[PDB]
Amino acid sequence: GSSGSSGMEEELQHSHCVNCVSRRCMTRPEPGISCDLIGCPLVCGAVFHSCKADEHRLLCPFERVPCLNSDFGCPFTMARNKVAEHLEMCPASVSGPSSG
């Protein structure tokens, strides 16, 4: 009788990608140096390396983000850029039409 398993997942950064700002990069994707490029899954309008994506999302505006005033308790959620349209009619904005 016996029993046992094996398997270890681990990935590192890409020397190339890590140093690749150009969105329209066309460098042969090498296993260890540079990976294939992929367009944002939110059609935000940016081209980054599949590996960078994870990081890009952090910046990408489209990325689903909670109301700027999430602290107050706004159950609303939308793109970082589409936060205004909501903030205008948002309760956690305490911003009246006060004009002149």
- Choice from 38, 53, 74, 78 touching Zn ion (CB under 5 A): 74
CB atoms within 10 A of CB 5: 4
Nearer to Zn ion, 25 or 65 (CB): 25
Number of residues that bind Zn ion (CB under 5 A): 17
Quick check: 69 and 92 in contact, CB under 8 A? Answer: yes
Quick check: 66 and 77 in contact, CB under 8 A? Answer: yes
Nearer to Zn ion, 8 or 21 (CB): 21
Nearer to Zn ion, 1 or 24 (CB): 24
83 contributes a contact to Zn ion by CB under 5 A? no
Q: Give strand ranges (E) for 1-100.
A: 37-39, 47-49, 64-66, 77-79
35 contributes a contact to Zn ion by CB under 5 A? yes
